């Protein structure tokens, strides 16, 4: 209620950003590429063209940060590292997640795993997608690509909640002191668990790129080994889900993969670029004064990438807010870009489509349960909270 962008820019709330993002990018692609948001007390950038600009620039930008990531992730945490610190890390976690790496694993442990779950939702009759398949699949296979075979998913799992759990801990006092410190006590546990587990792929981590006598050590490692834990863990599943719900929308598409399962590497990616999982999650920090058109920004200041609006950009692609098999080739920023790419942007999708073509094999007549409905919430993290389904 009111009696002018600015003006409307101070009265958004977070819980509208969470609830129905999408008219609010539409605005801020056409009147503020990169705002202030008082409400988010941040920078969002909204467009493509300020998203990659900001997100590839490694002079006047930095990987980004924050209290929590330093409290729950620890120091020197891959996100926010740059320079060699960052290539050193890098060196670390990308070898087991390169194609070459990996490639043993789709056969040997990937299909063997979705199948076990695809098994158990066959018993059942019918599914709830999400909880029933799409995550038990992807923290099983997160967990084994990244050395953690011994590990079981019920502890991943709960690892993983708590690492969140940890950085939406933010409530804080004038001072910037945190007011509930007891809710980084599961992460502080979590972490002891994770180094209680490695310090008796991990051959890789302490030795590539490094010289034969100077090896990494475990204290340079756990923070960014909780980076994974944290933001890889779920994501594969994520990106089924947003694939699956898309192809929904256009019946005669789903109907299409379902019967040529060499169109869902295609489908994957449009999945990505319709409902970006990590929709506005990812930032850089300015260091030093950068003028954006009319926003400038100060170092220290936080700076949301909102690659799921990116990717809904009007300037970059036709009707974006529509799930499009058949649209024009082009890239995506789902998985960010420069420096600080996701480093499993190749194994993700083969997890994927391994997911979803022994889904789609087993039950092609697979469609949502029109007695639920699929809530679909969140501005940093997107996605469906649920999906039931049926089948014949
Ligand atoms: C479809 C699934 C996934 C999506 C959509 C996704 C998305 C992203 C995004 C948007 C970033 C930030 C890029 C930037 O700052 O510009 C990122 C970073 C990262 N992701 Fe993923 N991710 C996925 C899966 C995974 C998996 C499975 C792993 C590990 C096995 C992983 C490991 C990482 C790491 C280590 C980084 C930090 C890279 C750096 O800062 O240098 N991600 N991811």
């Not at 590839?56 to 990987?63: I, L, M, Q, V």
């Not at 690892?159 to 940890?166: D, E, K, Q, V």
């Not at 863990?233 to 929904?248: I, M, N, R, V, W």
């Amino acid at each position: 209620k009111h009696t002018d962008t600015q003006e409307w820019l101070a009265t958004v709330t977070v819980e509208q950003l969470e609830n129905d993002p999408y008219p609010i990018f539409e605005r801020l692609r056409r009147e503020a590429p990169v705002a202030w948001i008082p409400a988010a007390h941040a920078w969002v950038a909204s467009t493509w063209e300020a998203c990659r600009t900001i997100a590839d620039d490694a002079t006047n930008f930095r990987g980004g940060t924050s209290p929590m990531h330093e409290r729950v992730l620890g120091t020197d945490h891959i996100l926010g590292a740059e320079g060699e610190t960052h290539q050193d890390l890098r060196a670390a976690v990308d070898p087991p997640l390169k194609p070459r790496a990996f490639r043993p694993l789709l056969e040997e442990q990937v299909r063997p795993t979705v199948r076990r779950y695809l098994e158990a939702i066959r018993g059942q009759g019918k599914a709830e997608l999400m909880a029933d398949y799409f995550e038990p699949i992807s923290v099983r296979c997160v967990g084994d690509v990244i050395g953690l075979t011994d590990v079981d998913s019920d502890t991943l799992r709960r690892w993983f909640h708590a690492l969140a759990r940890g950085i939406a801990n933010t409530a804080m006092d004038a001072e910037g002191r945190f007011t509930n410190p007891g809710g980084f006590a599961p992460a502080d546990e979590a972490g002891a668990e994770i180094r209680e587990v490695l310090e008796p792929a991990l051959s890789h981590y302490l030795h590539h790129g490094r010289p034969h006598g100077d090896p990494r050590t475990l204290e340079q490692l756990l923070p960014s080994l909780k980076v994974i834990i944290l933001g890889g863990l779920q994501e594969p599943g994520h990106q089924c889900a947003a694939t699956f719900l898309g192809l929904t929308t256009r019946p005669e598409q789903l109907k299409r993969v379902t019967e040529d399962a060499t169109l869902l590497p295609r489908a994957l990616t449009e999945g990505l670029r319709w409902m970006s999982p990590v929709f506005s999650a990812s930032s850089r920090l300015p260091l030093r004064e950068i003028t954006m058109g009319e926003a400038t920004m100060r170092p220290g200041q936080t700076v949301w990438l909102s690659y799921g609006s990116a990717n809904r950009d009007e300037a970059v692609f036709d009707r974006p807010d529509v799930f499009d098999l058949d649209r024009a080739t082009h890239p995506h920023l789902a998985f960010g870009t420069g420096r600080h790419l996701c480093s499993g942007s190749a194994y993700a999708p083969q997890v994927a489509r391994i997911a979803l073509e022994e889904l789609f094999t087993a039950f092609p007549s697979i469609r949502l349960d029109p007695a639920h409905e699929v809530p679909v919430w969140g501005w940093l993290f997107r996605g469906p909270q649920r999906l039931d389904v049926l089948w014949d």
